[PDB]
Amino acid sequence: SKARVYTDVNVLRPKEYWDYEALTVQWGEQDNYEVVRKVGRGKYSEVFEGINVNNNEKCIIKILKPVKKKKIKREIKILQNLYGGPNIVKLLDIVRDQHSKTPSLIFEYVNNTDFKVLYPTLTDYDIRYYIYELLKALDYCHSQGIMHRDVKPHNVMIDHELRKLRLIDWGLAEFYHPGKEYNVRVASRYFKGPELLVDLQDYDYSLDMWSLGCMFAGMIFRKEPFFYGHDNHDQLVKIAKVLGTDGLNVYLNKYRIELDPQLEALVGRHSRKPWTKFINADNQHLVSHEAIDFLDKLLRYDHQDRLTAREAMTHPYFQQVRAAENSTTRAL
Ligand SMILES: Brc1cc2nn[nH]c2cc1Br
């Protein structure tokens, strides 16, 4: 398998663009940034609101727990390569404390609201807007030869008053090289695409579109996480109990994949459940024919059949936001 879009971006860039192990980090001065308060704990990073003591601007400080220097360099190189892209978090500095040498990334601050608080206050056209903004970030990173690999609400910061969206946490992101066999232990369980769950290692940007689909289903149906498996095997089972096993078997045959025997037994046999089955009185105001059609075109087993991010932006679901922003670029 090879990506059907942005296939060859990395050979159209100098070697130094993607060869992150060769990066030499130019460290800033740690004493320029003061921690103000904690905002979150990740598995191996800690995130603080900070202040730049020189220009007094707010910032976010991400302190990275030891992981291979290869991984720190990968995250830094990706953030540098994506700097200035639409709805991408902006990396402002790279510092480390004098004594422990633990690295910290300095970002531009975003006034986020927790999705558990924010999403219940979003109406139909708010969802259309923010998904469109997320698609702009994914199309951009894909166009620059990068797959995020951890798309989920927790990695999408939103300043709702300023309608500002930033795609964050590039620590699992990778460069796409056609033919490359990647680690399938990426993303977070509930957002993993079927390719990861069946050990299809030569996956591509389209992984991120499955993850987006999961996020989107969770929003419009108010069922989050939408696919709630108790382990990586059961994650496939939860997907198969919605999409059905007939489509799974077609997919496995196309890509010449032999399903693990234990996994095959766990998946069993299931009919496809129509998307309308998830509609209820509480969520119905968020569902339209256009939302269902868009969702259906994201959540497909076959990664090569999913909408790309740029194709998604053309879908009728986004008619209004697309027309509104096109007007402003004309005025520019
Ligand atoms: Br807001 C915000 C929160 C973050 N957590 N991890 N990285 C982050 C960057 C920004 Br900006």
DSSP string, 63-126: EE-S--HHHHHHHHHHHHHHTT-TTBPPEEEEEE-TTT--EEEEEE------HHHHGGG--HHH
Contact 9 CB / ligand 1 (< 6 Å): no
Residue 109 CA: nearest ligand 1 atom is 11
The Cα–Cα gap between 84 and 93 comes to 14
Contact 169 CB / ligand 1 (< 6 Å): yes
Distance 176 CA to ligand 1 centre (A): 24
Q: Are 186 and 196 in contact (CB under 8 A)?
A: yes
Q: Angle 141-71-137 (CA atoms, 0-180°, nearest 5)?
A: 15
Residues of the chain with CATH 1.10.510.10: 1-18+110-332
- What homologous superfamily does CATH list for 19-109? Phosphorylase Kinase; domain 1 (3.30.200.20)
- What are the CB-based long-range contacts (under 8 Å, 24+) for 72-75? 72/103, 73/20, 73/21, 73/23, 73/25, 74/20, 74/171, 74/173, 74/174, 75/105, 75/170, 75/171, 75/173
Q: Is 62 annotated as a binding residue?
A: yes
Contact 75 CB / ligand 1 (< 6 Å): no
Residue 105 CA: nearest ligand 1 atom is 7
Q: Which amino acid is at 163?
A: R
Residue 107 CA: nearest ligand 1 atom is 11
**Rg (alpha carbons) of the chain, rounded to whole number:** 20
The Cα–Cα gap between 8 and 45 comes to 32
Instruction: Verify whether residue 150 is a known catalytic residue.
Output: yes
Peptide linkage before 225 cis (omega within 30 of 0): yes
Q: Are 190 and 235 in contact (CB under 8 A)?
A: yes
Distance 237 CA to ligand 1 centre (A): 33
Report resolution (Å) to 1 decimal.
1.5
The Cα–Cα gap between 222 and 279 comes to 9
Contact 112 CB / ligand 1 (< 6 Å): yes
Q: Are 145 and 9 in contact (CB under 8 A)?
A: yes
Catalytic residue among 93, 139, 150, 169: 150
Q: Are 51 and 33 in contact (CB under 8 A)?
A: yes
Positive/negative CA dihedral, 58, 82, 181, 256: positive
Burial bucket for residue 280 (CB in 10 Å: 0-12, 13-18, 19+): exposed
How remote is the C-alpha of 112 from its chain's centroid?
Answer: 17
Q: How many CA atoms, within 13 angstroms, populate the side-chain half-sphere of residue 230?
A: 1
Residues of the chain with CATH 3.30.200.20: 19-109
Locate 313 and state its tokens: 């932006």
Kindly report the number of other CB atoms within 10 A of residue 117's CB atom: 9
Domain 1-18+110-332 has CATH 1.10.510.10: yes
**What technique was this entry resolved by?**
X-ray
